């Protein structure tokens, strides 16, 4: 019933990875963590790690919501990818840093035909080595439904605010 984690943890998980792809969502924007994320990334690919962004079409609360924020923080266009031209890369990825996402990764979209989020395509974060969720609590997202991916083998719960929590994860990663 849910595994939790801390800044140092995540710092470790991601620091010793080959491929890590970010997954910004409405959370990442409520906390205005564009830059903190842009940092954790350039000093992740500084070690040598492989970084990319998985922008899901309805991420956030408006069309292009993650796009404007990432752009404000200067994340190179060629690092940002759309749900389709990248969903196949999670399989061969060590970590899926889900900073602010939730409903966008919920597998109940492919499964439980009883759900409100049924049918909507999603990024394959579950098909990744290890998941790294971030969120102030255990509340649901827009849809208002628990994301089962929340508690399972490689799913972490780095509870807290996205800007702070990403700011610390940057810190303990020098």
């Amino acid at each position: 019933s849910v595994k939790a984690g801390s800044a140092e943890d995540a710092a470790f998980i991601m620091k010793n990875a080959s491929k890590v792809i970010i997954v910004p969502g409405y959370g990442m924007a409520v906390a205005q963590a564009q830059h903190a994320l842009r940092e954790m990334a350039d000093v992740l690919k500084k070690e040598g790690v492989e970084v990319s962004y998985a922008i899901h079409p309805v991420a956030g609360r408006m069309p292009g919501h993650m796009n404007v924020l990432l752009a404000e923080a200067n994340v190179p266009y060629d690092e940002v990818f759309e749900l389709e031209e990248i969903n196949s890369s999670f399989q061969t990825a060590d970590v899926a840093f889900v900073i602010g996402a939730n409903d966008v990764t919920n597998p109940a979209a492919k499964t439980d035909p009883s759900s409100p989020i049924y049918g909507m395509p999603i990024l394959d974060v579950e098909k990744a080595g290890t998941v790294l969720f971030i969120k102030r609590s255990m509340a649901s997202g827009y849809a208002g439904v628990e994301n089962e991916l929340f508690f399972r083998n490689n799913t972490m719960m780095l509870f807290g605010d996205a800007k702070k929590m990403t700011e610390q994860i940057v810190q303990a990663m020098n």
Partner: protein, 366 residues
């Protein structure tokens, strides 16, 4: 079977229900795409690139729709009662997909019914996650929100971004967005990136987070701190008085646009300012705005362009074409060239207005 796209005859409507990318997908689904020539000129889609995609070109509207089993367009077809009978051109028994504006245009719905046409009014699309790729309401409103800032920048005599120069400093433009739906969100985004100091206000309290998620500053009478709290409009006025560009996006389905800026208010504003009323086609959020023109009183340019999305027809169109295609694809099949709409599909039951001679949709007094 045969699907066809005509040119948009309604005045000041440069959009088109098609795109190269989508032609190729339609073809791929066993269709025979036909499009009236020059139907995408205003959207920068040439018959050349349109054919190069897999689509045949027709000389006239009449000829394109001639014998199509499925027809797509952006605005509802024109009836005989309007001067041009396009609905007449559509083949009897055909399928029509477009922005019908059904619940607000009983006539066209009836016109279509005569000819036993089956119409799916895209704007009635259900709000359900798996259909966000089918929502034309947000795809277009989104580009219109973008456009308001651009139109606003255009009419304002100062730059948006603050600029420190050798000759001195010029302060940032201040924007105030009323209504935080999709259009207003993209507005805040576009204004901020340009460098404006954006403020936003909306009666739905859940709005504060959204607004802040874009860098905005929600307007609140927080003497309190989330009788007649009606003096909320005094916090607003306090900000509107320092505003340079004010963008109003409040809209209600089937009812007149709710006044958001009283003339009594446009007076208290500063000379040189401009108000963008995306609600103009519905009475406007500002009673001074006039459908199609930029009126000036009290020193404020109250802009009221109509069909804003069309002002971004080059992008508006392909998005719109994708909405149509995503709606249709799940119904095309083997029979290897026939389409069937399972009535169990909510997407089909809430979008359909009339089927084979009979207005079906509940809300339409039948």
């Amino acid at each position: 079977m045969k699907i066809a796209i005509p040119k948009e005859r309604r005045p000041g409507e440069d959009r088109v229900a098609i795109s190269p990318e989508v032609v190729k997908k339609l073809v791929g689904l066993g269709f025979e795409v036909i499009v009236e020539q020059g139907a995408g000129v205003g959207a920068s889609i040439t018959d050349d690139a349109l054919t190069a995609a897999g689509a045949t070109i027709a000389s006239t509207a009449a000829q394109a729709l001639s014998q199509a089993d499925v027809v797509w367009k952006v605005q509802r077809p024109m009836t005989a009662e309007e001067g041009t009978d396009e609905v007449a051109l559509i083949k009897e028994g055909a399928v029509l997909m477009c922005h019908l504006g059904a619940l607000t245009n009983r006539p066209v719905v009836e016109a279509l019914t005569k000819r036993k046409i089956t119409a799916y009014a895209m704007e009635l699309m259900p709000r359900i996650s798996r259909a966000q790729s089918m929502d034309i309401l947000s795809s277009q409103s989104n580009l219109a929100g973008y456009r308001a800032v651009i139109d606003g920048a255009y009419e304002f005599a100062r730059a948006f971004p603050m600029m420190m120069t050798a000759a001195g400093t010029v302060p940032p433009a201040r924007v105030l967005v009323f209504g935080v739906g999709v259009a207003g969100l993209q507005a805040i985004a576009t204004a901020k990136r340009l460098g404006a100091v954006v403020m936003a206000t909306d009666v739905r309290a859940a709005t504060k987070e959204q607004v802040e998620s874009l860098g905005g500053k929600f307007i609140t009478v927080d003497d309190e701190a989330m009788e007649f709290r009606k003096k909320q409009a005094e916090a607003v006025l306090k900000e509107l008085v320092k505003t340079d560009i004010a963008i109003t996006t409040a809209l209600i389905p089937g009812k007149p646009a709710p006044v958001l800026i009283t003339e009594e208010m446009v007076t208290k504003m500063k000379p040189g300012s401009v108000i963008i009323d995306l609600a103009v086609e519905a009475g406007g959020n500002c009673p001074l705005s006039e459908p199609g023109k930029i009126v000036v009183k009290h020193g404020v340019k109250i802009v009221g362009h109509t069909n804003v999305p069309s002002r971004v027809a080059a992008d508006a169109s392909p998005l719109f074409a994708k909405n149509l295609l995503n709606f249709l694809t799940p119904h095309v099949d083997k029979d290897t060239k026939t389409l069937v709409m399972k009535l169990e599909d909510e997407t089909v039951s809430g979008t359909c207005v009339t089927r084979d001679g009979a207005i079906v949709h509940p809300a339409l007094t039948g």
